[PDB]
Amino acid sequence: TLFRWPVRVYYEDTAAGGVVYHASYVAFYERARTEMLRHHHFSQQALMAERVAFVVRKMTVEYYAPARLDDMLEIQTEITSMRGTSLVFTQRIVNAENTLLNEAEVLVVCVDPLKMKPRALPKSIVAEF
Amino acid sequence: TTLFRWPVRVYYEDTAAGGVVYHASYVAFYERARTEMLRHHHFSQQALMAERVAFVVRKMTVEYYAPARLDDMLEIQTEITSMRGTSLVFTQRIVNAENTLLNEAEVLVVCVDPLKMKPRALPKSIVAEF
Amino acid sequence: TLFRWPVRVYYEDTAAGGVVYHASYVAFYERARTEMLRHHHFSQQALMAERVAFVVRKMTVEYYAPARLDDMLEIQTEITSMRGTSLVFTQRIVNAENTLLNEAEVLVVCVDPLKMKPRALPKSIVAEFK
Amino acid sequence: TTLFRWPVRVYYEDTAAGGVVYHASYVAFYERARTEMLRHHHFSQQALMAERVAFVVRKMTVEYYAPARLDDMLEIQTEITSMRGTSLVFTQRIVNAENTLLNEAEVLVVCVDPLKMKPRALPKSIVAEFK
Numbered sequence A: 001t002l003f004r005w006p007v008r009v010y011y012e013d014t015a016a017g018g019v020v021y022h023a024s025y026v027a028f029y030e031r032a033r034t035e036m037l038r039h040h041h042f043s044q045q046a047l048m049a050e051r052v053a054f055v056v057r058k059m060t061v062e063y064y065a066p067a068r069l070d071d072m073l074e075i076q077t078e079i080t081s082m083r084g085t086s087l088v089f090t091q092r093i094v095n096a097e098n099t100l101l102n103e104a105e106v107l108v109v110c111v112d113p114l115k116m117k118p119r120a121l122p123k124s125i126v127a128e129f
Numbered sequence B: 001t002t003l004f005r006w007p008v009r010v011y012y013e014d015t016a017a018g019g020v021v022y023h024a025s026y027v028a029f030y031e032r033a034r035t036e037m038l039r040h041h042h043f044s045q046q047a048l049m050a051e052r053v054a055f056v057v058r059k060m061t062v063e064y065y066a067p068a069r070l071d072d073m074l075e076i077q078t079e080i081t082s083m084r085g086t087s088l089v090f091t092q093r094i095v096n097a098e099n100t101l102l103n104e105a106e107v108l109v110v111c112v113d114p115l116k117m118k119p120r121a122l123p124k125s126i127v128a129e130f
Numbered sequence C: 001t002l003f004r005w006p007v008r009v010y011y012e013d014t015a016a017g018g019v020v021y022h023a024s025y026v027a028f029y030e031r032a033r034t035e036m037l038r039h040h041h042f043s044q045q046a047l048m049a050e051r052v053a054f055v056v057r058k059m060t061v062e063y064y065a066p067a068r069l070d071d072m073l074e075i076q077t078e079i080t081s082m083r084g085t086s087l088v089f090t091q092r093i094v095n096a097e098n099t100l101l102n103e104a105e106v107l108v109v110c111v112d113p114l115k116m117k118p119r120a121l122p123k124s125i126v127a128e129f130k
Numbered sequence D: 001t002t003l004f005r006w007p008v009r010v011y012y013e014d015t016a017a018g019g020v021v022y023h024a025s026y027v028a029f030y031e032r033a034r035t036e037m038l039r040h041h042h043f044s045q046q047a048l049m050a051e052r053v054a055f056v057v058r059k060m061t062v063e064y065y066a067p068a069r070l071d072d073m074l075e076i077q078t079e080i081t082s083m084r085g086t087s088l089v090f091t092q093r094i095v096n097a098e099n100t101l102l103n104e105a106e107v108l109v110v111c112v113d114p115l116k117m118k119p120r121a122l123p124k125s126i127v128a129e130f131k
């Protein structure tokens, strides 16, 4: 099931060319994944105290069109694959005219954050998705 | 003054090793709140740029009283406390969900022509509003 | 050939939990491409005079092991293919024990800065990196 | 007056729309220079964390006189001007390649135990380095 998250573009996100810096979109995608988890009752600050954490293992981003200061964007996010210790997020960003700006596929691994050691997905998360 | 409130969620990008918000992130938070205060009064800084009007920070003092942390929902509070000629002073504060005062700042802002970095007078539209 | 660029990890690059934030690596790779180009005298000035800019079209990043605060990293960068209007950069990050932390493949398109429309690579870029 | 100098190149990531360096990026640059001044004196904050020693910014004043721009090579200049109990004051400035003064800052830094966010005395070996 799709999760939608709005993001306003501020000065901090722009670069000298007048458009959003290509790495700023990477952060935007992370916020949307965090809010999708939050919507299903997962706080990563809370989980870290339980020695549960999620890290990016692989990421592909393809850039089609720019965003500019003051644009209101929408990040669209789905969990498309789920396995033992990892899951795949498929994401994209559109602007207020529904123009596709870019899209990403993100492989995420569940780890023990003190050992950086992969651990099985909590069955709560497997059931919730 | 007419106070303006803006909520901000703390994400991983805002945090640093050791588990508190990085000190420069607060500076960005304060800027977002000034931008949204302007938006609430019908001003767009992308729009004003084509009109050769922009705002730059000239001086800033920040007090860090207590840390924010990952997943905190914060409130930025913003007032314009002084205006004259080309510049204005914002007084801003940050509180958390307990109403703990985490941070406060005083920001001197100068209106400039962006293609030249010259100070120019605050345009009458702005000063009329605030 | 191979171009090497050192990068020190600072607090701004780290996140809560004590590792480098994943988007920080993306900026590190961009610095190394910029410095690779500079090493061949393709400074920003030189690119502007050639009426070219470079934009990232597609990028894949593999995160094998974390960098941490105070690590001195080495970014290794090579142009692995060059065709028409685009370049592919292959890049890797190792730490001071030569542990492979990260690698990336970056498709970069040559654009004119007016419409940001694709344009053929400058003959000097082609001549230098063939 | 044992000044420490640190060079910084301005990259795209540091700039904002309009073509100047974003005002918060200077704050990061000053932090890098303090960290390198500590490193030159043989201290690592990652290592100090393991000993429950950390440094946090308590107050900062920044003055923006003139902008840095893409690809400028800057020099950050840093001195410790006060050192007392749990805290130090850093005085810093940024010049560009023509020695134009772009920026000045004063930063009050407090030593804390990072697990309790509670101030503690400066490590004796750090006090010895900068006295």
Ligand SMILES: CCCCCCCCCC(=O)SCCNC(=O)CCNC(=O)[C@H](O)C(C)(C)COP(=O)(O)OP(=O)(O)OC[C@H]1O[C@@H](n2cnc3c(N)ncnc32)[C@H](O)[C@@H]1OP(=O)(O)O
Pocket (backbone or CB within 6 Å): A048, A053, A054, A055, A056, A057, A058, A083, A084, A085, A086, A107, A109, A111, A113, A116, A117, A118, B012, C015, C016, C017, C018, C019, C020, C021, C022, C023, C063, C064, C065, C066, C067
């Ligand atoms: C971490 C501190 C806690 C706080 C979290 C901070 C949150 C902030 C968010 C970020 O910015 S994360 C920072 C950037 N990312 C990193 O630093 C991660 C660095 N990578 C690692 O440390 C290791 O790669 C990792 C611990 C994630 C995995 O180690 P391994 O090499 O032992 O993984 P392994 O080979 O055992 O396989 C793990 C899973 O990935 C799958 N996998 C690995 N490579 C794959 C691939 N290339 N394609 C498809 N699947 C792949 C693999 O099959 C398996 O799936 P399953 O067990 O569910 O079947």
Ligand SMILES: CCCCCCCCCC(=O)SCCNC(=O)CCNC(=O)[C@H](O)C(C)(C)COP(=O)(O)OP(=O)(O)OC[C@H]1O[C@@H](n2cnc3c(N)ncnc32)[C@H](O)[C@@H]1OP(=O)(O)O
Pocket (backbone or CB within 6 Å): B016, B017, B018, B019, B020, B021, B022, B023, B024, B064, B065, B066, B067, B068, B100, C011, D054, D055, D056, D057, D058, D110, D112, D114, D117, D118, D119
């Ligand atoms: C820390 C983990 C590893 C290090 C990471 C370094 C990252 C890189 C550098 C940074 O980015 S630092 C992040 C930004 N700075 C901060 O988060 C510092 C936040 N400030 C504090 O936690 C305290 O002010 C500090 C421990 C430094 C000093 O506490 P004190 O009480 O000893 O000093 P002070 O007298 O100056 O405190 C002023 C006011 O803050 C109040 N306060 C202090 N800590 C508080 C607290 N934890 N919660 C609520 N209020 C607090 C304090 O009681 C007092 O209130 P009143 O004036 O009304 O009496």
Ligand SMILES: CCCCCCCCCC(=O)SCCNC(=O)CCNC(=O)[C@H](O)C(C)(C)COP(=O)(O)OP(=O)(O)OC[C@H]1O[C@@H](n2cnc3c(N)ncnc32)[C@H](O)[C@@H]1OP(=O)(O)O
Pocket (backbone or CB within 6 Å): A011, B054, B055, B056, B057, B058, B110, B112, B113, B114, B115, B117, B118, B119, D016, D017, D018, D019, D020, D021, D022, D023, D024, D064, D065, D066, D067, D068, D100
């Ligand atoms: C095009 C940008 C559009 C907006 C995009 C940014 C929005 C996002 C928010 C930010 O991140 S703002 C970026 C950080 N802030 C700055 O870069 C502001 C830099 N400051 C200046 O360019 C000038 O100080 C300013 C135009 C604001 C005022 O110039 P003034 O000379 O009329 O005022 P002032 O007397 O306060 O300037 C103090 C000293 O700086 C000197 N100065 C100013 N501009 C200079 C310059 N360009 N080159 C060398 N010196 C300069 C000025 O002459 C004077 O030197 P002296 O008192 O020692 O004689």
